[PDB]
């Protein structure tokens, strides 16, 4: 076991230099410096990652380690009780330790998310650092270079020192501010204000090709917005600058990754080339753009973690990531990322998984699900909709949107969600350090804004199995479902013509006919059929998006059920479905009478 | 977070009840009634399962979970920082808990190995099991029932009380033999009596098909003689009864997992049918019977751990696993499972992996190894031959090579490794509860086989550098290379038309040119290859395994470089491979003055 750490002083500087140039076996060497003290010396790879919520740390991708004190080689031991920590014997009156390793990045999706392309890589220091045991993270002093594919741009939140030729030296940092400073790099590369002033905010964009950097001033203009709607709702900022990481890829693995000054993002080639065609994921710069208050500041006590590798506390995701999801959708109707319409629909869809589409609520709370990140790892699991899956993002999303009505209801709509924002993140301007906070920390908040039993709504929701969506009505709509198509569902299915069919026969498919999804309980569920069976023919007629489709809208109000030709494993067999309530999509439709609310929740200010 | 499990008396009886029946979904479910009295209790789903020596109890896959006592819903609350610990809050007055829930089973190979088919399953006890916490696992007598598939066969080391229908009631038995007591159960079944007596040894075949059940007479008797050789070894049986359970199937997940009176094992449906061709895994059931002796019996000391919930130290799987490997492999040959000209080349393998193969043995030691089921948890790694992958086994097996040829020199000839098995795992016949053990143990009965400094031996090679091939000429062979193909790796190329070539190219290749493997330094590596690219053509001439060996062959004492079009990624391009050494399989071969006692090694007692 590794002995806990300690606020005390580090004495002296932890280099970290890097050479990311093996593009080709996706390879970052790494060389870390460090004052060697005598007796028992404990290193660390870092396991539980700020923003990762679970212990992501890829320990098996760090190869070739050696270590030198004072040029001589030094055998290490890991502990086997903690693989993460390194345990060498420092010689007395030694003055310096040296190690040197390798982080053999993806390879292949199958290994992670890839770092190393041909035109652009991701340089996370978490991956490529060792720490001494037994310190704050934020006590450790370091200072952090690194060598780039020759000519390549960079971004970073971290301040550059020199760049001399392709070598980056960074100024001396804390330990924890490195880790939380990537580093995405790149030979197609755009740099665009989006706010000046005394705290500035910058988007930087890397793509596979050039052509997809040609962002249209109105593009560009929904970004600035987003800084000026957070401006609104906050009243301030935590940074003292801030630079968006996007990166506009087919090769480079996806990424959402918030950052207290950065967050690392990805997306489609064509987020501004097909502006129409790539909005569903549009959210992704305001959901981490928002956590820079909602997460990086202020985090839960139990989350705040005094190094890497000791185990974080997820109870209050559902603030941290649950109100973060909720902003996201917000800010990205208020700032122009999505049109109403798009936000309006996507809303009804979360409502729409929470009122028919997570049966798994009988039994486990969303309060439980935020056990998922260390319980799953996000590995795959056969029903999203009945072992539950991190619902704390969308679940709570949909207890904020409540606890905005409530808010409402109670101060005649003079209070609403905005005014617990700017309460509880909206202090101390231009602090970045970490700002922690309890459940009644949330509480005693909330009753600020206006007086209620705050504690007992939260946990009835969060602890409890009914009903979530509350918020929708309370704001003067209605969720309902009828055949036209959600706008999200669409654009998701579309191009690829898969089927989306949740809420009519209980499952998802590809267009080659592969199940992708089984609602538990649902039609499909009902006739055996799990996901990666195929549905091969509709009432004899070979299978398409469009031809089941046109077989549940011809079954709906009629006694004749869907015939389906189903291939299981090596085994072909027909099932009859009786289903005839005909394709279902939610949406979101005024209550007449009612105030509406919920437009001006999402309303740009 | 959890109470630690104290050697205590446990009241009562854990009773466990499976419906084993939802073959479509592939769910088991499951109701646990254990005794209770009021206050705080908590429950644990095992975690650290023995023979997998990593913390892989499926707890994501614990769904539907209810907890009821004295007929009333009580609500349960999971540790975070144990994501395995249930609690509850158990009323006055209570004498009982009921907990039911559902193992979710994987319904792909990405979720896991799969348990369930339309004709066979698997039944691993510790995937349907709630225990309270605070008791040596030992201490917990429990009871298990299953309800079967309608006429289904099923095959358990665990005595049955009684069938009624289709519902098995097992005697009571201590709650660790539970879960080391696994079930198979299917339509296709033939059981074969591989020993009687007092102690019988029966082997329990399950298939996709009934016709691969048809094992023919000399094949039923290699799996006699490899019990008769285990006895000629140890003299000893560490069981009351043995159950080999073997699937024949492509449907069932692949498994080998030892226990006291068991193993699970599976083979492809041509285990008997074809012989002479699916002979490279038939090692299978002779390694894991072995770790009846070697593992079970037997085990580390920090192995042994009093529950299934507080973590596993591996730091002698070089025995373990190790000098199980070594036997699976020699007793393959002493028994007939395998002929002596394919053990002689399977042995050639693992020397010339080491010799060869294993470039990160620079940096890393064998010993260290012994952390990567924690590690890596058999996720997919770039470089198994320079990260190094549990080479505990084979790097091990190497190892008990060289023992058993010190052993001979040191007596000359008059012992040798079997007297160390016969000392170290010979005692105590009929003995099936865990024996433990420690490093020193270890060297001092390998030190009362013959006396040495056992223990600087064993650490010169499980934590250094250097060679591990030694046995091999002590033994009276050489490792050589040349272009006549090994056994295995034609056995293991053919159908598929593969093509390794790890001593040449550096690289191996599937039919489609797709590189699968790259050694670390080599030819292809120098070429920046990576697996997932594509060789398109060689010399020009589209890619085919022949087609790249007479392009190895053809270049062998030349000048002219080989010329690779490779696809990498969307990119072509054409690389010089300066390699002329032809192709290279490793063999052995006798050093004609020396002793021959590697042949005495693999010959039948
Ligand atoms: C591309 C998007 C889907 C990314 C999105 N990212 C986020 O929500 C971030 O704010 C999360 N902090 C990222 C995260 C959370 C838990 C475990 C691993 C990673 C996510 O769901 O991971
Ligand atoms: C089919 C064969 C390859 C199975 C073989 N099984 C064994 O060696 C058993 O003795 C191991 N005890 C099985 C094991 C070890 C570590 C982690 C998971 C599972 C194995 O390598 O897993
Ligand atoms: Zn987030
Ligand atoms: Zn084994």
Same sequence: chains 1, 2.
């Avoid at 490529?128 to 006590?139: H, I, W």
């Avoid at 964009?205 to 249209?216: I, P, Q, R």
């Amino acid at each position: 076991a590794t002995a806990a750490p300690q606020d005390v002083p580090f004495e002296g500087t932890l280099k970290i230099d890097v050479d990311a140039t093996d593009l080709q076996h996706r390879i970052f060497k790494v060389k870390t410096t460090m004052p060697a003290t005598p007796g028992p010396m404990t290193l660390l790879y870092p396991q539980w990652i700020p923003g990762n919520h679970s212990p992501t740390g890829p320990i098996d991708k760090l190869a070739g380690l050696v270590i030198k004190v004072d040029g001589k080689v030094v055998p290490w031991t890991r502990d086997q009780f903690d693989v993460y920590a390194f345990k060498v014997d420092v010689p007395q009156g030694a003055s310096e330790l040296v190690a040197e390793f390798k982080f053999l990045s993806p390879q292949a999706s199958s290994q992670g998310r890839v770092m190393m392309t041909p035109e652009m890589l991701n340089l996370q220091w978490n991956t490529t650092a060792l720490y001494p045991a037994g310190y704050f993270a934020r006590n450790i002093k370091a200072q952090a270079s690194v060598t780039l594919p020759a000519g390549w741009s960079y971004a970073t939140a971290m301040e550059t020192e020199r760049r001399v030729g392709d070598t980056v030296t960074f100024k001396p940092i804390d330990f924890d501010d490195l880790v939380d400073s990537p580093m995405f790099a790149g030979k197609y590369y755009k740099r665009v204000e989006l706010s000046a002033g005394k705290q500035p905010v910058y988007l930087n964009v890397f793509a596979d090709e050039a052509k997809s950097l040609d962002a249209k001033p109105e593009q560009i203009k929904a970004h600035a917005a987003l800084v000026q709607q957070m401006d609104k709702l906050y009243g301030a900022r935590h940074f003292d600058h801030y630079e968006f990481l996007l990166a506009l890829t087919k090769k480079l693995g996806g990424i959402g990754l918030e950052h207290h000054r950065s967050s690392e993002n990805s997306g489609a080639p064509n987020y501004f080339t097909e502006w129409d065609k790539s909005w569903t994921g549009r959210d992704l710069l305001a959901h981490e753009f928002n956590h820079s208050w909602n997460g990086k500041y202020r985090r839960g006590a139990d989350l705040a973690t005094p190094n890497f590798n000791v185990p974080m506390g997820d109870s209050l995701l559902w603030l941290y990531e649950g109100q973060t999801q909720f902003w996201g959708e917000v800010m990205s109707a208020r700032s122009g990322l999505w049109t109403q319409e798009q936000a309006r629909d996507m809303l009804a869809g979360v409502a729409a998984q929470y009122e028919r589409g997570r049966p798994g609520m009988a039994w486990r709370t969303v309060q439980d699900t935020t056990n998922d990140p260390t319980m799953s790892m996000r590995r795959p699991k056969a029903y999203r909709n009945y072992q539950m899956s991190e619902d704390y993002y969308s679940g709570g999303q949909m207890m904020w949107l409540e606890v905005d009505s409530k808010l409402r209801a109670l101060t005649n709509n003079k209070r609403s969600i905005d005014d617990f924002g700017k309460a509880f993140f909206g202090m101390k301007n231009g602090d970045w350090d970490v700002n922690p906070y309890t459940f009644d920390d949330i509480v005693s908040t909330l009753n600020g804004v206006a007086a209620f039993d705050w504690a007992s709504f939260l946990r009835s929701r969060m602890d409890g199995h009914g009903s979530l969506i509350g918020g929708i009505e309370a704001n003067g709509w209605k969720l309902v479902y009828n055949d036209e198509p959600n706008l999200a569902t669409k654009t998701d299915e579309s191009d690829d013509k898969d089927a989306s069919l949740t809420y009519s026969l209980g499952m998802s498919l590809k267009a080659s006919g592969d199940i992708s999804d089984v609602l538990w309980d649902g039609p499909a569920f009902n006739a055996g059929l799990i996901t990666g069976n195929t549905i091969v023919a509709v009432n004899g007629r070979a299978f398409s998006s469009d031809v089941i489709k046109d077989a549940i809208t011809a079954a709906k109000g009629t006694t004749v059920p869907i015939e389906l030709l189903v291939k299981r494993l090596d085994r072909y067999d027909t099932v009859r479905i009786d289903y005839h309530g005909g394709l279902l999509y939610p949406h979101l439709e005024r209550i007449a009478g009612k105030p509406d609310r919920l437009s001006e929740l999402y309303k740009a200010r």
